[PDB]
Amino acid sequence: NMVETEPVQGCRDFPPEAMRCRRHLFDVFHATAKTFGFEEYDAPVLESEELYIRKAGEEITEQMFNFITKGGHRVALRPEMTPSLARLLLGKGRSLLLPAKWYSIPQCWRYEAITRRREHYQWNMDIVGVKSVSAEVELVCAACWAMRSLGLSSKDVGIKVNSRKVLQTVVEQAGVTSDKFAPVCVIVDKMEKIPREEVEAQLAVLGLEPTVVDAITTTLSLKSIDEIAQRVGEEHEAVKELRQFFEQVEAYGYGDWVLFDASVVRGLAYYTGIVFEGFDREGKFRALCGGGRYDNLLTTYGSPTPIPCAGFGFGDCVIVELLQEKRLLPDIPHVVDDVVIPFDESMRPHALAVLRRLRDAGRSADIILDKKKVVQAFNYADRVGAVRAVLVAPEEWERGEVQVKMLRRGFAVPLDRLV
Amino acid sequence: NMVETEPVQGCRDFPPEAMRCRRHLFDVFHATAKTFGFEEYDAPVLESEELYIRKAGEEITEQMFNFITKGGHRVALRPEMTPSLARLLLGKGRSLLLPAKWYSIPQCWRYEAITRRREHYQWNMDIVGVKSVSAEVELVCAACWAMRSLGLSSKDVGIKVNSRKVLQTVVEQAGVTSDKFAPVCVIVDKMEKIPREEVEAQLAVLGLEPTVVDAITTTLSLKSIDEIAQRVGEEHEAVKELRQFFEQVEAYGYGDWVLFDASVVRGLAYYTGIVFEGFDREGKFRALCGGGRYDNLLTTYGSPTPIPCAGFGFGDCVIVELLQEKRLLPDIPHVVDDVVIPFDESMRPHALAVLRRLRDAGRSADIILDKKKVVQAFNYADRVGAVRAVLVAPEEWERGEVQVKMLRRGFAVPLDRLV
Numbered sequence: 001n002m003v004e005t006e007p008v009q010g011c012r013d014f015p016p017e018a019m020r021c022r023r024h025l026f027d028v029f030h031a032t033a034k035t036f037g038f039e040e041y042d043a044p045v046l047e048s049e050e051l052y053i054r055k056a057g058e059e060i061t062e063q064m065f066n067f068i069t070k071g072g073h074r075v076a077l078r079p080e081m082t083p084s085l086a087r088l089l090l091g092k093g094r095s096l097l098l099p100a101k102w103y104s105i106p107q108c109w110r111y112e113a114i115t116r117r118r119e120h121y122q123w124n125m126d127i128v129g130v131k132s133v134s135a136e137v138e139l140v141c142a143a144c145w146a147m148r149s150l151g152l153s154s155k156d157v158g159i160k161v162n163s164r165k166v167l168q169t170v171v172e173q174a175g176v177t178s179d180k181f182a183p184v185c186v187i188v189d190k191m192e193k194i195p196r197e198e199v200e201a202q203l204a205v206l207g208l209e210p211t212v213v214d215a216i217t218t219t220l221s222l223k224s225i226d227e228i229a230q231r232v233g234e235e236h237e238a239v240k241e242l243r244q245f246f247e248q249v250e251a252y253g254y255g256d257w258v259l260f261d262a263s264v265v266r267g268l269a270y271y272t273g274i275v276f277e278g279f280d281r282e283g284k285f286r287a288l289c290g291g292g293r294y295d296n297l298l299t300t301y302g303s304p305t306p307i308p309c310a311g312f313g314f315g316d317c318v319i320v321e322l323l324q325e326k327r328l329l330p331d332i333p334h335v336v337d338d339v340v341i342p343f344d345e346s347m348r349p350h351a352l353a354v355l356r357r358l359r360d361a362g363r364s365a366d367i368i369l370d371k372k373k374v375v376q377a378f379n380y381a382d383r384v385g386a387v388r389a390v391l392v393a394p395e396e397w398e399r400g401e402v403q404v405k406m407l408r409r410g411f412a413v414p415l416d417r418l419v
Numbered sequence: 420n421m422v423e424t425e426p427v428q429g430c431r432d433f434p435p436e437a438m439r440c441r442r443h444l445f446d447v448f449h450a451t452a453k454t455f456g457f458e459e460y461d462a463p464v465l466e467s468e469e470l471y472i473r474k475a476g477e478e479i480t481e482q483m484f485n486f487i488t489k490g491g492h493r494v495a496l497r498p499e500m501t502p503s504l505a506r507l508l509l510g511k512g513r514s515l516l517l518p519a520k521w522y523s524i525p526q527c528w529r530y531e532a533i534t535r536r537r538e539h540y541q542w543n544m545d546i547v548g549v550k551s552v553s554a555e556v557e558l559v560c561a562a563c564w565a566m567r568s569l570g571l572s573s574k575d576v577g578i579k580v581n582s583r584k585v586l587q588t589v590v591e592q593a594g595v596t597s598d599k600f601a602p603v604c605v606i607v608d609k610m611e612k613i614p615r616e617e618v619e620a621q622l623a624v625l626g627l628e629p630t631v632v633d634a635i636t637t638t639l640s641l642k643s644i645d646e647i648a649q650r651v652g653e654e655h656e657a658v659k660e661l662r663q664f665f666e667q668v669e670a671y672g673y674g675d676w677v678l679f680d681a682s683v684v685r686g687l688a689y690y691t692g693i694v695f696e697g698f699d700r701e702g703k704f705r706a707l708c709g710g711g712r713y714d715n716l717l718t719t720y721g722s723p724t725p726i727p728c729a730g731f732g733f734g735d736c737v738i739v740e741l742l743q744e745k746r747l748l749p750d751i752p753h754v755v756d757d758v759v760i761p762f763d764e765s766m767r768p769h770a771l772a773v774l775r776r777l778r779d780a781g782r783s784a785d786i787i788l789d790k791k792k793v794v795q796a797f798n799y800a801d802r803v804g805a806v807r808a809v810l811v812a813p814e815e816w817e818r819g820e821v822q823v824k825m826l827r828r829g830f831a832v833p834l835d836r837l838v
C-alpha cells in the first residue's frame with residue numbers, strides 16, 4: 001500500500017527548499033516589526049465561529065473554514081487575525097496599557113466550493129489606542145519598509161490610500177441609514193474586478209436609488225484629493241486626515257511609495273477611516289497587502305469604551321510571486337560552518353569531542369554519522385556548503401592537532417586554535 | 420452584547436507577555452537546530468486522517484482531533500509531526516539526498532472526552548538515512564544542548580535510554596508473532612503510571628500467556644546494561660548499540676546527562692530500536708521530551724526501499740513549568756533602543772525624519788504617535804525600556820541638532836552623530 005504523498009487539498013508543504021524562502025520572508029516581517037517597535041503575539045488558529053458572524057456579505061466570512069466539534073460547538077479555522085486580536089484586547093480591558101503595537105504572522109484559512117489555495121500566512125500589524133493618522137502613517141511605512149527590505153523599490157510597488165469617510169458622507173447625505181454603509185463598502189469593493197452592471201445591481205438590492213448609486217460611482221472615480229475637497233470641502237475631516245497622512249509619509253522619506261486612489265475601499269465591514277492596499281506598479285499581481293482604521297470594532301464586541309485601532313495584513317503568497325518575477329529570491333542553499341570528519345570509526349570519539357568544541361564556540365557544525373571514505377565526507381561537506389572540513393586523523397591527534405581544509409591542500413591545527 | 424474573551428476550550432492565547440516566554444524557548448530550539456546542522460521544514464496542520472490509522476491502541480491516535488470536511492473527506496489536526504515528515508520524505512523518493520537532518524516546531528493537537536490542554540507546540544528533530552547509533556547520539560545531545568542553553572544542568576534533568584530490541588527478542592522467543600510486538604510496547608508503556616494488574620490484564624487480552632508476561636516484566640526491571648547482557652548475550656545487537664551510544668555521548672561531553680532505563684519504551688507503535696525520554700531529576704514533572712529509532716515506518720508507508728530514521732519531539736509546556744520552578748524564566752520586558760519625541764505637533768515631520776535615520780541605522784525605535792506632554796512621552800519611554808529618548812525641539816533643530824537623554828540631564832547632538 002502507498003500513502004497519499006500530496007498534502008491535503010489547497011494546503012502547502014514546506015520542505016527545506018520552500019521553507020528557506022518562507023523563512024527569508026518571515027525574517028523580514030519580524031525584523032521590520034522590531035525596527036518599528038511592535039510586540040509579538042499569537043492566538044489559537046481555532047476560534048469560535050460566533051467571532052466572525054458579521055452579516056455584511058463579506059467574502060472572508062462567506063468562505064469560512066468551519067465545522068462542528070463532537071461537543072456540538074461551532075468553530076472555525078480563523079479566516080483572519082483581527083477578530084482574535086480584538087478578543088485579546090477586550091479580554092485585557094483597562095489593564096491594557098495604550099498605545100499598544102502588536103504583530104503576528106498567523107496562518108489563516110478559507111474554504112470554497114471551487115477546489116485555489118485554502119491557507120496562507122499573513123503578517124498582521126496593528127496599532128491600538130491611537131486616534132490620529134500617525135498610526136496609519138506608521139503602518140504604511142512599516143509595509144513599505146518590509147518590501148524595501150526584500151529588495152523592492154518604489155518603481156516596483158506602491159501603496160494606494162483612501163478614506164471611507166468621504167463615501168460615508170455621500171451615503172448618509174443621500175438618506176441611507178448608516179447600517180447600509182458597511183454592506184455598501186463590501187459591494188463597492190467588488191467594483192474593481194467585476195462588471196459595473198453586476199455591482200450596481202447589488203446596491204439596488206440593498207434598496208438604494210439610482211441617483212444615490214450615481215454619486216457613489218462618481219466619487220470612486222475622482223482622481224485627486226483636491227477634487228475630493230471640491231466635493232466635500234477642504235476641512236471635511238477626510239481631507240485634513242489624508243493631507244496629514246501624506247505629509248507625514250513624505251517627512252519619513254517614503255513619499256514615492258504612496259498615492260491617493262478614491263476607488264480603494266477594501267472588502268471588510270469594519271474599516272471606518274483610512275484604508276490602503278499595496279500593489280505592483282506593472283499591474284500584474286493581486287493586492288500585496290491591505291489594511292485600514294477600524295475604530296468601532298471593539299465597541300461592536302461589547303467594549304464599554306471605544307478603542308481606536310488600525311492595522312494591515314500582508315500575505316505570504318503574492319509577495320513571493322512578485323519577488324520571483326523580479327529575481328529577488330535567489331536560492332541560498334542550506335549551509336554550515338564546519339564538517340567534522342573522523343578518519344575512520346576508531347576516531348569517532350575524538351571527532352565528537354572536536355564537534356563539541358566547535359559548537360561550544362558558536363559554530364554550526366556537522367559530524368559524518370555513517371561509516372564512509374574521506375572523499376565521500378568531502379562530497380557531503382560540499383553538499384552542505386561548509387566553509388571548513390575538519391579531519392580528525394590518528395597522526396594529528398597524537399600531536400594534539402586536527403587537519404583543517406578551507407573549502408570557501410590542508411593544514412594541521414592545534415585543538416585550541418580551531419575556534 | 421459581549422463576545423467570549425476566553426479562547427476555545429483547551430487552547431492558549433499568547434499575548435506579548437506569554438509570547439516572549441514562548442519566543443525565548445523557540446529561539447533555543449532554532450539555535451540548537453542550527454548548531455547541529457538541521458534544516459527547517461513545515462507541513463499543513465491539517466492532514467488526512469488515513470495518515471494516522473495505525474491500529475495499535477496508541478493514545479496519540481485514540482485522542483485524534485478529527486472531523487469531516489463538507490466534501491466528505493476525513494481529516495485531522497495533526498496529533499504529531501512524524502507522519503507528515505514521512506509523507507514528505509516518501510514524496511521525494513530517490514531525489515532526497517541522504518543523510519537528511521530536518522527539524523520543525525509544529526503545533527500539534529488532541530481531543531479528549533475530558534474537558535486538559537488540546538494543543539501544544541512540539542520541537543521535532545529527525546535524522547533520516549543513518550543506520551548507526553550516531554544518529555540517536557546526535558539527537559540526544561541536541562536535546563541536552565537545548566536544555567543546557569535554557570540554563571538547566573545535569574543536576575536538574577536527564578535523558579534515560581533503552582532499546583526495544585531486547586524486548587523484541589523476549590516476545591519473539593516466547594512464540595508471540597511479531598505483529599503483537601508494537602501493541603505490546605503500547606501496553607507496556609502504560610506500566611509506569613497505571614496498576615500492574617491493569618497492564619497485565621491488557622497483555623492477556625492480546626493472547627499472551629502469564630509466563631510470557633513474566634519475562635517482559637522482569638526485563639523491564641533490569642537495572643543495568645550488564646544485567647541485560649547476562650540475559651540476552653554481550654553481542655545481542657541491543658548491547659553493542661547501547662554501549663556505542665553511551666560511549667559516543669560520553670566523548671561529546673554529555674555523559675552526566677544520560678543513563679540506562681530498561682522500563683523506557685514510549686507509547687508509539689513505530690519505534691524499532693533505541694528509545695529515550697527526558698526527565699526532571701526531582702521526579703516532579705511529566706516527560707520533557709521523547710523519541711527513538713523507527714526504521715520500518717517508511718516501508719510501512721509503501722517506500723520501495725527501507726529508510727532508516729530516528730528523532731524526537733520536545734513539547735513546549737512541561738519544559739516551561741520546569742523552567743519557572745527553577746526560576747530560569749525571568750520576565751525580560753519588551754524593549755526598544757530609542758524613543759523619538761516631537762516637542763509638539765509642529766515638530767512631527769522633523770521627528771519622523773529623525774525616526775527614519777535611526778531605523779536606517781538598524782535601531783529599534785518608536786515615535787510618540789499621539790499628542791502629548793514631554794513628561795508623558797518620557798513615561799512611555801520608560802514603559803518600553805528605551806536606552807535613549809530623542810527629543811526633537813525647535814531650538815536644537817535650528818542648529819541641525821536634537822536633544823538626547825540616556826535612560827539606561829540631556830544633551831544636544833547633531834543629526835549625523837545620532838547613529
Ligand SMILES: Nc1ccc2cccc(O)c2n1
Pocket residue numbers: 060079080108109110117118119120315
Ligand atoms: N482570508 C484568506 C484566508 C485564507 C487564504 C488562503 C489563500 C489566499 C487567500 O487570499 C486567503 N485569504
Ligand SMILES: Nc1ccc2cccc(O)c2n1
Pocket residue numbers: 332333335336337384385386387408
Ligand atoms: N558556509 C557558507 C556560507 C555562505 C555561503 C553562501 C553561499 C553558498 C555557500 O555554500 C555558503 N556557505
Ligand SMILES: Nc1ccc2cccc(O)c2n1
Pocket residue numbers: 479498499527528529536537538539734
Ligand atoms: N499528542 C499531543 C497533541 C496535543 C497535546 C496537547 C497538550 C499536551 C500534549 O501532551 C499533547 N500531545
Ligand SMILES: Nc1ccc2cccc(O)c2n1
Pocket residue numbers: 751752754755756803804805806827
Ligand atoms: N533597551 C533595553 C535593553 C535591555 C534591557 C534589559 C532589561 C530592561 C530594559 O528596560 C532594557 N532595555
Ligand SMILES: N[C@@H](Cc1c[nH]c[nH+]1)C(=O)O
Pocket residue numbers: 080081082124125126268290291292310311312313
Ligand atoms: N484582517 C484584515 C487586515 C487587517 C489587519 N488589521 C486591520 N486589518 C484582512 O485580512 O484583510
Ligand SMILES: N[C@@H](Cc1c[nH]c[nH+]1)C(=O)O
Pocket residue numbers: 499500501543544545687709710711729730731732
Ligand atoms: N512523534 C513522536 C516524537 C518523534 C519525532 N521523531 C520520532 N519520534 C512523539 O510525538 O512523541
